[PDB]
């Protein structure tokens, strides 16, 4: 029931995050706004688990390490940092970024645990009931794009919560904000593809997601450079579709 999962996830995410967005500007109750955001983030995971509970392969993909293809380890570790530093290099012909290598941007230990927790709470849902529901009705290629769109529009309430990444980028420039929502599209394709190449291993998707977040924190870049990064992501997403195009369009 693909029509039920996403619409139910869409509404639960939207009720909790927009409530947390109201508290985020409240001068009285701002102290608790982050504990309302938590179930909002955890929604796709709990919805997915409930639908499954209401198969052994979900258990398998959760605990079976043998599903993982070790040939994809270099691309799991290295691709995002490579993309980031390439973006800085591509920036240089255009004005600025000489300073950027310095990586001036970026307590240090707990924020890791939070990033790993968010990568977990997201992928348990997306790599659970979510993408399987789409791939059953659709070709892999349009299932991945339908996922990319939903996942992008899933971040939509964050624009309205005080001091969030989505908030600040739109606060600064309309182009910085749109660039983010545009970048979720090829990002949803790359992570998805990586999951299939490792036999739908949810654990690997967690690691990959976590690694994408980590490198985006440690190796910080300006919003102007992130626009270039988005393009690099489209070129990588396009290249991946071409390499596995038979897999992408087969029925």
């Amino acid at each position, epitope marked *: 029931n693909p029509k039920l999962y996403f619409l139910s996830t869409f509404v639960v995410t939207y009720i909790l995050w927009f409530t947390g967005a109201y508290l985020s*500007f409240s*001068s*009285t109750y*701002s*102290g608790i706004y982050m504990l309302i955001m938590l179930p909002g983030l955890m929604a796709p995971f709990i919805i997915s688990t409930i639908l499954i509970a209401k198969k052994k392969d979900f258990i398998n993909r959760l605990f079976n390490l043998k599903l993982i293809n070790l040939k994809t380890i270099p691309v799991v570790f290295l691709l995002m940092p490579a993309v980031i530093l390439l973006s800085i290099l591509l920036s240089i012909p255009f*004005g*600025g970024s000489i300073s950027q290598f310095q990586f*001036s*941007g*970026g307590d240090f230990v707990p*924020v890791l645990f939070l990033l790993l927790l968010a990568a977990t709470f997201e992928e348990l849902g997306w790599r659970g009931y979510a993408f399987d529901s789409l791939q059953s009705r659709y070709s892999l290629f349009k299932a991945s794009i339908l996922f990319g769109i939903f996942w992008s529009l899933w971040h939509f309430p964050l624009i309205f919560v*005080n*001091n969030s*990444y989505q908030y*600040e*980028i739109f*606060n*600064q*420039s*309309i*182009w*910085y904000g749109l660039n983010f929502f545009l970048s979720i599209l090829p990002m949803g394709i790359i992570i998805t593809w990586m999951c299939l190449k490792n036999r739908k291993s949810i654990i690997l998707a967690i690691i990959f997601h976590f690694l994408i977040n980590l490198n*985006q*924190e440690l190796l*910080a*870049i*300006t*919003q*102007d450079t992130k626009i270039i990064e988005t393009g690099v992501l489209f070129l990588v997403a396009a290249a991946i579709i071409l390499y596995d195009k038979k897999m992408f369009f087969e029925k």
Partner: antibody
Amino acid sequence: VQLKQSGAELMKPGASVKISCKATGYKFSSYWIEWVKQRPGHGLEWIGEIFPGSGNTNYNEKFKGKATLTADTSSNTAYMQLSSLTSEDSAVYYCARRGAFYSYGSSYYAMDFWGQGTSVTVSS
Amino acid sequence: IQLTQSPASLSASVGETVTITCRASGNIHNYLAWYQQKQGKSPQLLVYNAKTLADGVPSRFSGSGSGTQYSLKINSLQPEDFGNYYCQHFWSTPWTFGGGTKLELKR
């Protein structure tokens, strides 16, 4: 990184002033420009901010209409215009920058560099 | 959100250690900066995110606090540390500064 502001002004009530703030040493379009008011006995008071390159602005409600922020990216200069001057407008005016925006570990939530200040006096 | 500084005035001698406090009327989630201002000069940044030293700032300065209560500490005051001090929150517009604290030379 340096912010140089224009010189002192002496004005009749009802006139307008345009204060400039020239930026050197960084990319002018990628950082917030702040404007702060300081009178003796009133401490620091925030006026508003502009993001050059996008033209986005966040104003204090009190200075809406009173203060007008603009920015020219070809000359790396931010401007603030004070209209309908009265005695209350007599103060020192600063422009200041915010840090570059990063998701984690940034001086973005700080006024990290300041201009030297522009003294404005308004009297008949 | 209004911010309140105490004390308004603080008398001290070279070598002493002093602490200035800042109170927010609402939770500002560590979005707090501290500035120093000499007479006739512009404010300079000392600390942001409540806890982080700005570039060039001596390590005798330090900031702490959370929620609604924040403070700045100067360990072993130097002659150059005498002047004014302000706190400022960055949680939500409008940004407000504290009334300031004047650190004067004891006599």
